[PDB]
Design a binder for this molecule. Structure first.
Ligand code: E8N
Ligand code: E8N
Ligand code: CL
Ligand code: CL
Ligand code: ZN
Ligand code: ZN
Ligand code: ZN
Ligand code: ZN
Lengths: 327, 327
């Protein structure tokens, strides 16, 4: 059994400590190729990501799952470059996020299923690099096209065994509808992570997903604008709940019996052009540890609050492997 | 004085008979790279475009202006390939159409001006190919972002001398607002073509633009769903006015004194993924002549209606050169 990474297949044991929702760069299709100066340069972006993934690896990370799709401007050659230089495995994604272009938005369920299966089974672009996860998104009630996306992701997963991970607007409880669509296609909830679930404190929502077998993506732990004076765009993005508040949802779900269904991540990036200018600077001041925030700050916080080392290892190592390994 | 093409600078006399609004492929950024099977294959698309541009060249076309921007999925290497194989000059474009991604839509006027100037002055992507026109779009009242686009296009034109060409929803008279924005930035109307102007019969609108000095883009002459039974998507795209009706607007503006301000084109393509599946098949049944429709069918129609050979040469050769040559 093997997981596809940007440097090829790896064994389950090789994945190790895995961050399940991360990005090298949050962009748009074609954007880094057309406007590399937006990032300084392409080399500057590469160097920043290598440095950050090095720091993460020193803190114990072995693999990240880059959940950048086509419409986040995923550049698998950029991921392979960074992966080789930092010695951190990167799993790439297929699927569609919240910014599909017209050439995607006009497609049928069958067509999209073809595209997702191309990326899982054949390769991304002309690279031969295969995705190891399918990423999808809603922000409230699904648009007609997003329902097609969710159905195509389910079809792709059913044919291949690769899991599905989601973006939600957690305040709208989107995982409810997402689950409904997925289940209508026959997808097992154990193949699905409902992401950005740490953006809500609603335990009735979180446990109702976990009770049916979903994995719960508590994937934005360091996202917080607390004590950012009067920066409306950072507040709108990051929220005003503390990282501790978010991290305590890990403990909460442990305490309810769902330790095997928890997936934790930073949802960090090294470049971010699909938001306001200089947001990466703002984010990096909030969390200078970047992708190392989970091991360096979250794990010790949870140990101080009484969570066991063994439970945290199961969450950071066992759960990601179970989720990623195709089934 | 020179015009930039995808194979480098050419003299004004080399441009010859020029179609001012065309596309090799109407797509989305990254799409042909990620999903070439949508088109059959990349080679099939190339071969179809070469065959079509050959037929056009035999009918007298020497240059086309490919008004595909970043968000139409412009692939300048594809254009150079096709240009070399067909021996037809292709002018490429910068700017933004109606499907900009978030990494564009979040940008300032100053940022966009940087991007358009990159594509005109330095090159597209890492190709060294420079755009020779800036393309912009509204569909009714401009969105806030589209106003920034129009202003940045004006700034880019003011620094470089390259012209601006527009997409409109002609039924909403968008050229009125477009002109207002452009003039507020100090752009000369003689540097601007208001496109898709053949989609309306409103001569008060058309003459009010031409009176202030705009060029008028009568650029979709073969676009018609007349006698396509019950195909709602083709009707919505193409309209139910005949090609003759559209072509008679050429004569109308001649007859009002605006022969030097008329630009004519087919607004054809060889691939079209940003609309419904199989639309290219539908379009190619309506107009099997493709980009040769203007010389093969429009020019003789207008001669039969009393327009002179010399006037039509001025419209197909002189006007494009005047417009494209930087000033
Ligand atoms: C009983 C919950 C537990 C104490 C198990 C070991 C890891 C930490 C959580
Ligand atoms: C007078 C308008 C004109 C007859 C001039 C020559 C070309 C055709 C139009
Ligand atoms: Cl702490
Ligand atoms: Cl005729
Ligand atoms: Zn997300
Ligand atoms: Zn993300
Ligand atoms: Zn248009
Ligand atoms: Zn066009």
């Amino acid at each position: 059994d093997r997981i596809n990474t940007v440097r090829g297949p790896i064994t389950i044991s090789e994945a190790g400590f895995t961050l399940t929702h991360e990005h090298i760069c949050g962009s748009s299709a074609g954007f880094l190729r057309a406007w590399p100066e937006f990032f300084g340069s392409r080399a500057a972006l590469v160097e920043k990501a290598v440095r950050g993934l090095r720091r993460a690896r020193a803190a114990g990370v072995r693999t990240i799952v880059d959940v950048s799709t086509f419409d986040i401007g995923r550049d698998v050659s950029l991921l392979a470059e960074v992966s080789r230089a930092a010695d951190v495995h990167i799993v790439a994604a297929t699927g569609l996020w919240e910014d599909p272009p017209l050439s995607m938005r006009l497609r049928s369920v069958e067509e999209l299923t073809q595209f997702f299966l191309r990326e899982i089974q054949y390769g991304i672009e002309d690279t031969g690099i295969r995705a190891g996860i399918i990423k999808v998104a809603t922000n409230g009630k699904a648009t007609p096209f997003q329902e097609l996306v969710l159905r195509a992701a389910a079809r792709a997963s059913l044919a291949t065994g690769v899991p599905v991970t989601t973006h939600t607007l957690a305040s709208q409880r989107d995982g409810e509808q997402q689950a409904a669509i997925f289940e209508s296609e026959g997808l097992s909830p154990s193949r699905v992570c409902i992401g950005h679930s740490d953006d809500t404190d609603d335990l009735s929502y979180l446990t109702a997903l976990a009770a049916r077998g979903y994995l719960i993506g508590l994937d934005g732990i360091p996202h917080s604008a607390i004590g950012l004076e009067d920066n409306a765009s950072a507040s709108a993005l990051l929220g005003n709940r503390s990282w501790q508040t978010r991290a305590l949802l890990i403990k909460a779900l442990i305490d309810q019996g769902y330790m095997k269904q928890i997936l934790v991540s930073n949802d960090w990036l090294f470049g971010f052009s699909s938001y306001v200018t200089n947001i990466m600077d703002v984010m990096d001041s909030v969390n200078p540890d970047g992708m190392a925030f989970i091991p360096l700050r979250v794990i010790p916080f949870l140990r101080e609050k009484g969570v066991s080392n063994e439970t945290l290892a199961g969450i950071t190592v066992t759960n990601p492997a179970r989720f990623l390994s195709p089934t």
